[PDB]
């Protein structure tokens, strides 16, 4: 059954970005999906995304521009102390100069760089590069 | 607990060194000793006004609560003035970066100030060794509703 709507959303985004589409459609559009997409959009990996409100769970149409290589989900959401964020970045990211590991942190869903600037850590969601 | 046969044993059940003087009739009937257990644990009015004895009670008995203050789900009220609680937790295996469900069964003395049943969340507090396996008293019972008011039959 459907166990991770963020994994389904990010799989749809990867599969459309691989085949070169400029847009996806994502069902069923959680808050974690919206915040993850807002981080990706803030860092420039997607364009505008628009939330269709049907009265059940929502859909999202994301405008993929061209600049995404691999957005993914680290499932399970591992507990991540502040000392081993850098193991996760060294494992998941292609280089030290770009790419972001998205963390669910009690200061909000955020990437690892402004998890480090706020000196906060927590569960891992996934990555974008 | 003002009823159900306090003197049910071969010995006279009384609080030690508490004297009921028969020559001078006391203004309050059958003088009772109680205490606050400390740590914000309210002495129940059943403990204050009851007739039970329970020398291992944390409020009317001779034990003191000191040390760990644990919390657990009652799984067995099948003893006399002793319950078994389940302290379920999660153990972290650092190889797999994952946890495993574990549990520990803690036998706890329960006062007859408290009426407990299987399913109640109780707060227990460490005392001196009460028996071979019991080192804790129930100091608080944390199940008031328990979703057990709407199960009964209707018309």
């Amino acid at each position: 059954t459907r166990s991770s709507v963020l994994a389904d959303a990010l799989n749809a985004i990867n599969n459309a970005e691989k085949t070169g589409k400029r847009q996806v459609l994502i069902r069923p559009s959680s808050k974690v999906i919206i915040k993850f997409l807002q981080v990706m959009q803030k860092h420039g990996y997607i364009g505008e995304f628009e939330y269709i409100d049907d009265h059940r769970s929502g859909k999202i149409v994301v405008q993929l521009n061209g600049r995404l290589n691999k957005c993914g989900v680290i499932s399970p959401r591992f507990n991540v102390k502040i000392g081993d964020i850098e193991k996760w970045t060294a494992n998941l990211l292609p280089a030290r100069q770009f790419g972001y590991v998205i963390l669910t942190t009690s200061a909000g869903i955020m990437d690892h760089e402004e998890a480090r600037r706020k000196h906060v850590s927590g569960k891992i969601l996934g990555f974008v590069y | 607990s003002t009823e159900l046969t306090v003197q049910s044993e071969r010995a006279f059940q009384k609080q030690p060194h508490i004297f009921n003087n028969p020559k001078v009739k006391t203004s309050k009937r059958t003088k009772r000793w109680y205490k606050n257990a400390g740590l914000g644990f309210k002495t129940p009015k059943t403990a204050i006004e009851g007739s039970y004895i329970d020398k291992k009670c944390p409020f009317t008995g001779l034990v003191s609560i000191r040390g760990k203050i644990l919390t657990g789900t009652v799984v067995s009220t099948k003893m006399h003035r002793t319950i078994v609680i389940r302290r379920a937790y999660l153990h972290y295996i650092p190889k797999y970066n994952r946890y495993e469900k574990r549990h520990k069964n803690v036998p706890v003395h329960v006062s007859p100030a408290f009426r407990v049943q299987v399913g109640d969340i109780v707060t227990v507090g460490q005392c001196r060794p009460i028996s071979k396996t019991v080192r804790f008293n129930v100091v608080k019972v944390s199940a008031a509703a328990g979703k057990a008011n709407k199960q009964f039959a209707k018309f």
Partner: protein
């Protein structure tokens, strides 16, 4: 097509698609103001109406249930909604 408008798909496409697989899922069914040849009163009958619907005053079957839409029977007249 590699680039398309997913927020505003064409009405011909949305009328082709399944009722669950549109942009917002809604029903393709409808209701009918149905009158008998005999009685003057009006009955509101579902399109896919599952039931031998009669009037309150009539003794007459208005629709007969089928696999999909109910078959409006016996020369009765209908209007949508």
């Amino acid at each position: 097509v590699l680039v398309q408008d997913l927020l505003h798909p064409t009405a011909a496409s949305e009328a082709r698609k399944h009722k669950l697989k549109t942009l917002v899922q809604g029903p393709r069914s409808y209701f009918l103001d149905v009158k008998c040849p005999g009685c003057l009163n009006i009955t509101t009958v579902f399109s896919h109406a599952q039931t031998a619907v009669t009037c309150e005053s009539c003794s007459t079957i208005l629709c007969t249930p089928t696999g999909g839409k109910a078959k409006l029977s016996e020369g009765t007249s209908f209007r949508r909604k």
